[PDB]
Amino acid sequence: SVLAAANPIYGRYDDLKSPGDNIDFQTTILSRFDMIFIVKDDHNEERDISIANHVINIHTGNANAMQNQQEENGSEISIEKMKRYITYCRLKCAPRLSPQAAEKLSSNFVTIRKQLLINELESTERSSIPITIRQLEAIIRITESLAKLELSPIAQERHVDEAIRLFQASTMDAASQDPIGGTSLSEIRRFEQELKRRLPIGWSTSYQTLRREFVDTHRFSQLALDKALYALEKHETIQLRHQGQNIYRS
Amino acid sequence: DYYLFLLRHSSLYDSFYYSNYVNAKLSLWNENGKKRLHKMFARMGIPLSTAQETWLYMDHSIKRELGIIFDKNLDRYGLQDIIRDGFVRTLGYRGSISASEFVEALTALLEVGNSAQKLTNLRKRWVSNFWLSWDALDDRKVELLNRGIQLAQDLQRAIFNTGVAILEKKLIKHLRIYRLCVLQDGPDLDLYRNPLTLLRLGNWLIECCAESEDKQLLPMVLASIDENTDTYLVAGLTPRYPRGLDTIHTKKPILNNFSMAFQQITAETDAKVRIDNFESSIIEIRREDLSPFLEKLTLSGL
């Protein structure tokens, strides 16, 4: 098994730049890998306070005590016992799938393939991270490895759901992250004037009525949703509440 | 036998290094002590690499002539009070154990093994440790004694590491009547919730203080912190004469008035203490209540 560490071009990911030219790996090499994690740095000062406290405590003056308690209350195990356990599990168990799990895997693969096609059709360029049959095999192997932890002869839905969650994380973090990459913008200005003109601060309108009127005009349905969620992302004066029906203007 | 720390179970170098009497007499907490120890070893003639081996594999000839080596070399450094007579027990092919080593193993196994609710949990842990130590007595168990010996080594290492820091920091405040030191902050302070461990630390500190040129015999007060309970554990310690003293100045052993002082202060002032330990000189006091109390003890007739 290969565990590789790499840095994107220009150091930091530079999210404002397109995802296509932040990674220099070809399509062929990325296909063999099946868990691509993009760890980005963030600043909110609460995680920063937590990390600063963690490192300051982990300085050897204090940690040498606390970790000991982790082996006294049974919250963690030592490294050599883990090595013995992993070699034992590798020698003994080899799980297998079930038809319900196979159906769930097939449905999930079709869903992600269709979502990839939608993102490619909107973006109008080839995706820098592909989805192929290798990914289906990868998810199958993840489910089997999860079932291998408990020495279960048969893999069931309890492991498949967690494997699907892990794949969803590793997919939505890297491949389907900002596919738009930032009719053109002439409509974008045209819409934003109409909402200010027709919808004052503090009032609200139904989603269906706005969609109806703007499909009746030249706007159509596809253009509305994208900048609707954009203005929501701006969050300066547009808020969602009460499911996807109440368009509140903050 | 000698006043040495686990001589037959640790290397001779560590045996000299961790011995309380040797530490007091040679000041091993700074570098001059280590230089004097190396001079000692070189003049005795044991190689530094040889002296750092297990007592089992240590050279047979030197093990045989160690008595003569000590007799001829210890006089200059003034450690001729380290040699004494002790009891050794041997059973078949198991090995040899001395009374001092066995009691240190027992003490350490008592120390380490395995608000009000947490105090009760600590007390039940202590009684469980007592039962495990009791079980360790019989001759049919030796994995319950090797573990005790290794734990004794670890605890002595920790005590030495804390005492050297205390002596560096000079936390021992010299008042007019009694010395005082408080372990406000540091590493591994959770170990000192045990009164017997605190007494061990205080014994080492009082030996170090006695082995000095000061001509004042003053009681010592030692306190610790238990951040979970926010309480100070205060233990009063009696002064001790040097071990190398005649019997004429031993008309009466030094008494302990700390129990009387604590009971009088608590009966005349509504302090938030808990005096329940069988040792009448050990009390638990509040973090906010320590100081006023202290001044009271300063102003009360001891």
Curated annotation (Swiss-Prot), chain A:
Q: Where in the cell is it found?
A: Nucleus
Q: Which domain of life is it from?
A: Eukaryota
Q: Where is motif Arginine finger found?
A: 31-34
For this chain, the family text in UniProt reads:
Belongs to the MCM family.
Mention any additional remark: Present with 10300 molecules/cell in log phase SD medium.
The role this protein plays is: Acts as a component of the MCM2-7 complex (MCM complex) which is the putative replicative helicase essential for 'once per cell cycle' DNA replication initiation and elongation in eukaryotic cells. The active ATPase sites in the MCM2-7 ring are formed through the interaction surfaces of two neighboring subunits such that a critical structure of a conserved arginine finger motif is provided in trans relative to the ATP-binding site of the Walker A box of the adjacent subunit.
> What interactions and quaternary structure are annotated?
Component of the MCM2-7 complex. The complex forms a toroidal hexameric ring with the proposed subunit order MCM2-MCM6-MCM4-MCM7-MCM3-MCM5; loaded onto DNA, forms a head-head double hexamer. Interacts with CSM1.
What is the recorded name of this protein? Answer: Minichromosome maintenance protein 5
Swiss-Prot record, chain B:
Q: Where in the cell is it found?
A: Nucleus
GO BP, sorted A to Z: DNA replication initiation; double-strand break repair via break-induced replication; mitotic DNA replication preinitiation complex assembly
Q: Does the keyword Phosphoprotein apply?
A: yes
Q: Name one GO molecular function term.
A: chromatin binding
Keyword terms: Cell cycle, DNA replication, Nucleus, Phosphoprotein
Q: Which residue pairs form cystines in this protein?
A: none
**Primary residence:** nucleus
Q: Which GO terms describe its cellular component?
A: CMG complex; DNA replication preinitiation complex; nuclear replication fork; nucleus
Free-text function comment from the UniProt entry: Required for initiation of chromosomal DNA replication. Acts at the origin of replication. Also has a role in minichromosome maintenance.
Assembly: Assembles into a complex with MCM5/CDC46. Interacts with MCM10.
The UniProt entry's sequence similarity note says:
Belongs to the CDC45 family.
Q: What else is known?
A: Present with 1730 molecules/cell in log phase SD medium.
Full protein name:
Cell division control protein 45
Give the gene that encodes this protein.
Answer: CDC45
